[PDB]
Design a protein around this ligand. Structure first.
Ligand SMILES: CC(=O)N[C@H]1[C@H](O[C@H]2[C@H](O)[C@@H](NC(C)=O)CO[C@@H]2CO)O[C@H](CO)[C@@H](O[C@@H]2O[C@H](CO)[C@@H](O)[C@H](O[C@H]3O[C@H](CO)[C@@H](O)[C@H](O)[C@@H]3O[C@H]3O[C@H](CO)[C@@H](O)[C@H](O)[C@@H]3O[C@H]3O[C@H](CO)[C@@H](O)[C@H](O)[C@@H]3O)[C@@H]2O)[C@@H]1O
Ligand SMILES: CC(=O)N[C@H]1[C@H](O[C@H]2[C@H](O)[C@@H](NC(C)=O)CO[C@@H]2CO)O[C@H](CO)[C@@H](O[C@@H]2O[C@H](CO)[C@@H](O)[C@H](O[C@H]3O[C@H](CO)[C@@H](O)[C@H](O)[C@@H]3O[C@H]3O[C@H](CO)[C@@H](O)[C@H](O)[C@@H]3O[C@H]3O[C@H](CO)[C@@H](O)[C@H](O)[C@@H]3O)[C@@H]2O)[C@@H]1O
Ligand SMILES: *[C@@H]1O[C@H](CO)[C@@H](O)[C@H](O)[C@H]1NC(C)=O
Ligand SMILES: *[C@@H]1O[C@H](CO)[C@@H](O)[C@H](O)[C@H]1NC(C)=O
Lengths: 109, 378, 122, 378
């Protein structure tokens, strides 16, 4: 395969803070990584393509950067509804491979 | 009748004008056109012709059912007038076999064609209407040669064979022939991990070739051959503009001395004119399938590691199927520098169009221009 | 107004053959590759293949090449997919998606379908 | 092999004997004949041939559906033996393109063919089986040249192109080529308001041409070219015998220096031999459609304003469709004066016969006689 990796499927946040998630590739994928958010029910949207570029309708707050093998998304002003399972995937070469995903959990009340 | 010598340079290639196109399939729907595949065009000091391996039947004939298979008793190397269809009353058979190469040396012409079972394949070098020498399989696993013209300096014509595995190592050899007879041969020498099907062109007393690394490479292996001292050298094209099909997507940086990773086990025959700054590369415009064709100006790509295109020109659209490409040049045209020509096999049938039981093709060829001519699609 | 409309479910029987649909809306169907991707109950996402509708090319994932054939009825801008010989091990959810690239396998799957649930039962 | 020079006069043309006729459509109903249109015939010092732009398919073949369209990737200029059909096993392709001209200079032959999209059209001058020079669209709106043979004096061959609008002004240029290479070019000079498609003939060291004013004229624009000093001049034929199709009806008086009014926006290619008193003009016999053909003796029509016919000879009846006409001459036949020959394209299919989805043609050609031979229709 091209091993796509996301370390562990869960993170917390106390609703308000900036959070970071990281994807690892098995080879230097030049910079062809993309980030996908699955809503609590079904619906997967596209947020970033080619490591840094945001899709059409995106919150100003979603960041992406990386080189070679390791690529991270940063969400800054964690507005609750953005809590879900994020996925990285590549298209340096096909087959396209996706990560495992990371669900985000919140902690406040 | 004097053995030609490479006395000239490449000219500044700024555009590409049409040279040939045979509308073979459209004629073949109502004419006695032969079923071919793998084509090339080559010249002799007063004539240029189209060449191809035929599958021994007409398109509209019932024995076309099954021509997706490309090695059998019935294939013959045929030559036919420039831009004619390969018609049953026209095509000249050259030799019997399923892999070939021909080049006129200056005095007369040589053509090699391989036939055989897969474990007992044979090459016979015909020079000028009679057979002269035979080669037998040194590595008993499909002996093949290039499927484009060879190039000849002073009686000596370098040509390249590979017998072995496609999926990992094989024994390829450079062979030098003068008037049919063998003069020597060499193993491959260089960093090129695997080479097979080589597009060669001769320019200022030496010949250079791009081949195919079917095993690992997405960048192309290169062999630069010196005909006079009979020596050679291999490497890869240094670019990020990857040209094999299938490839991975275009990288920021490239690999000069080792094959580029990602897509592996597969590939297409292709050409290039690497003349320093005057370098144009060609590729399919589709990452995964032989659809489309384009030529791109990528100055110094053989040496420069992060070489990206400064000019382009599209030949076939992504909507239209293409197939093998390769290079030829008319060494006998009057001039100071040679004019770079090339061809694209436009394949048509199986596998891509499963509603016909045949597989055949057309050809289109193009040569350099000094002017910035407008582009079209063919 | 990219709508890839896909039914919520198909209820099937072991070994048979079902046929998926993904109704592409509000864009130029002939101009973009459609992509089919699987999400099995407790695993990450597996892409099955591609279909370019204005030329007819298709490409399949290594294992999937046996189970899925991709099809499309251009007049109804429907991409489709026939999976034959279904069983427990392939009770999952399937999606169609399109790349931003218009023929390029590049720029990522930009608009995604609903996701249709495959349940095999006796 | 010595560059021919126009050393002779026109002979007294009193009648017209048949020269060629290929019965193409009638053969083509059961033979592998190609679909063509726009034909001409030209000679080299030991052979004369028929020429035409083919539409890349046979008549009875399914790709003939749609050959009313006259510019596409699949058209090729073809030559074929005198009075043969353009048969798939016969016709020689010359070049790839949808507009052309060829003339043998004395040593070897030159042929120009234009290809391209309508906003990015290209001309490549092939001289003697290889391409030599390219011209790119100076005015990006369909670059076209004449569709008859060019004429050559001493290595220099004048030929005429027009790139621009049909419905009103365009930039036409005279070009002089020697052995493929360009020697100069000029804008049009003269009172001829618009010229396109030119029938040219060389006679006593100069060449003269009738063209088509598609915009306004019903009388024909004329260009008289001096090859040696490389100069030219335009005007109109002075007659009342109007020869373009469609025309208005025949006037009492005519216009020498401006185009004749009434019918405008439209026209056919045509020829003339204006040799003073020895002047014969040709036209369609139908005011509104390409039906019929006739030759008429109209002494001094280039200069005389109220010139009407003193002798005639009918070639095609009004009941039979005709199409483009133009001139050629065998400059290599043994003699004191040249013999004026001409052709008429006999078109057949769409638009006029809507019950077939194709469009194709035949040819018939004729040369002068000294005797008063009897007339027939072909
Ligand atoms: C003389 C001249 O101007 N030449 C132009 C040419 O002009 C036409 C003119 O338009 C016509 N007349 C009128 C009145 O308009 C008449 O004809 C003349 C020509 O004589 O136009 C062409 C086309 O526009 C020009 O070619 C371009 O030149 C630039 C250099 O400035 C190149 O960058 C261009 O190439 C790239 O873009 C192509 C699309 O136009 C694209 O298909 C091609 O593959 C190149 O892009 C790939 O590589 C980039 C990095 O290397 C990458 O960023 C791209 O995203 C793209 O990569 C993707 O696609 C690849 C497959 O296509 C794939 O492998 C890869 O993995 C990735 O997915 C173009 O040649 C000419 O200069
Ligand atoms: C050597 C010889 O005698 N030649 C004759 C020729 O002889 C035949 C002979 O008959 C045969 N043998 C036997 C035993 O009989 C053997 O072959 C020989 C030839 O070798 O016969 C032809 C036909 O008769 C002669 O040609 C005529 O010559 C006269 C000159 O004296 C011309 O005027 C004639 O032309 C006009 O009449 C034609 C009909 O015959 C007509 O179709 C043509 O267009 C000419 O008429 C148009 O113009 C006139 C003014 O310019 C006008 O008044 C007319 O009304 C007509 O105009 C109308 O029609 C036009 C289209 O046709 C249209 O544009 C216009 O707007 C208007 O409506 C004829 O050539 C030969 O000399
Ligand atoms: C070709 O070049 C060689 C030098 O490599 C020279 O010796 C030979 O005589 C030349 N042959 C011809 C035809 O000029
Ligand atoms: C052709 O005529 C020119 C004069 O214009 C003359 O100089 C030249 O030598 C002649 N060529 C031949 C073949 O006679």
């Amino acid at each position: 395969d091209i091993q796509m990796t996301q370390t562990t499927s869960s993170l917390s946040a106390s609703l308000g803070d900036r959070v970071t998630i990281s994807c690892r590739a098995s080879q230097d994928i030049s910079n062809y990584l993309n980030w996908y958010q699955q809503n609590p029910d079904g619906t997967v949207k596209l947020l970033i393509y080619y490591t840094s570029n945001l899709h059409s309708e995106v919150p100003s707050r979603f960041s992406g950067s990386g080189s070679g093998t390791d690529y991270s998304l940063t969400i800054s002003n964690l507005e609750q509804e953005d809590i879900a399972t994020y996925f990285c995937q590549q298209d340096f070469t096909l087959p396209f491979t996706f990560g495992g995903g990371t669900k985000l959990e919140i902690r406040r009340a | 009748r004097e053995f030609n010598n490479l006395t000239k340079g490449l000219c500044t290639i700024n555009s590409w004008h049409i040279y040939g196109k045979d509308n073979a399939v459209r004629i073949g729907e109502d004419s006695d056109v032969l079923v071919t595949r793998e084509p090339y065009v080559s010249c002799d000091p007063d004539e240029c012709r189209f060449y191809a391996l035929s599958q021994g039947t007409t398109i509209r004939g019932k024995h076309s059912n099954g021509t997706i298979h490309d090695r059998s008793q019935y294939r013959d190397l045929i030559s036919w007038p420039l831009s004619s269809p390969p018609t049953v009353y026209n095509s000249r058979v050259e030799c019997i076999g399923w892999s070939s190469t021909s080049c006129h040396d200056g005095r007369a012409r040589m053509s090699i064609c391989i036939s055989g079972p897969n474990n007992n394949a044979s090459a016979v070098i015909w020079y000028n209407r009679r057979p002269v020498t035979e080669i037998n399989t040194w590595a008993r696993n499909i002996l093949r040669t290039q499927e484009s013209e060879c190039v000849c300096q002073n009686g000596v014509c370098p040509v390249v064979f590979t017998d072995g595995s496609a999926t990992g190592p094989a024994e390829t050899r450079i062979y030098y022939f003068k008037e049919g007879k063998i003069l020597k041969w060499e193993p491959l020498t260089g960093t090129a991990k695997h080479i097979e099907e080589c597009s060669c062109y001769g320019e200022q007393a030496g010949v250079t070739c791009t081949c195919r690394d079917n095993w690992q490479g997405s960048n192309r292996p290169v062999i630069q051959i010196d005909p006079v001292a009979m020596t050679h050298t291999s490497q890869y094209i240094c670019s990020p503009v990857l040209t094999d099909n299938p490839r991975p997507n275009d990288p920021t940086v490239g690999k000069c001395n080792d094959p580029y990773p990602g897509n592996n086990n597969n590939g297409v025959k292709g050409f290039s004119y690497l003349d320093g700054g005057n370098t144009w590369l060609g590729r399919t415009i589709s990452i995964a399938s032989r659809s489309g064709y384009e030529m791109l100006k990528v100055p110094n790509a053989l040496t420069d590691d992060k070489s990206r295109p400064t000019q382009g020109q599209t030949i076939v659209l992504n909507t239209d199927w293409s197939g093998y490409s390769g290079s030829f040049m008319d060494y006998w045209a009057e001039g100071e520098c040679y004019r770079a020509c090339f061809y694209v096999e436009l394949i048509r049938g199986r596998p891509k169009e499963d509603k016909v039981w045949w597989t055949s093709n057309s050809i289109v060829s193009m040569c350099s221009s000094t002017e910035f001519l407008g582009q079209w699609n063919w | 107004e990219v709508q890839l409309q896909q039914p919520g479910a198909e209820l099937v029987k072991p070994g048979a053959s079902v046929r998926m649909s993904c109704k592409a809306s509000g864009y130029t169907f002939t101009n973009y590759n459609m992509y089919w991707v699987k999400q099995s109950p407790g695993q990450g996402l597996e892409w099955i293949g591609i279909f370019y509708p204005g030329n007819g090319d298709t490409s399949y994932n290594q294992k999937f090449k046996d189970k899925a054939t991709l099809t499309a009825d251009k007049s109804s801008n429907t991409a489709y997919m026939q999976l034959s010989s279904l069983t427990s091990e392939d009770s999952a959810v399937y999606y169609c998606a399109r790349s931003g690239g218009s023929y390029r396998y590049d720029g990522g799957f930009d608009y995604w379908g609903q996701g249709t649930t495959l349940t095999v039962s006796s």
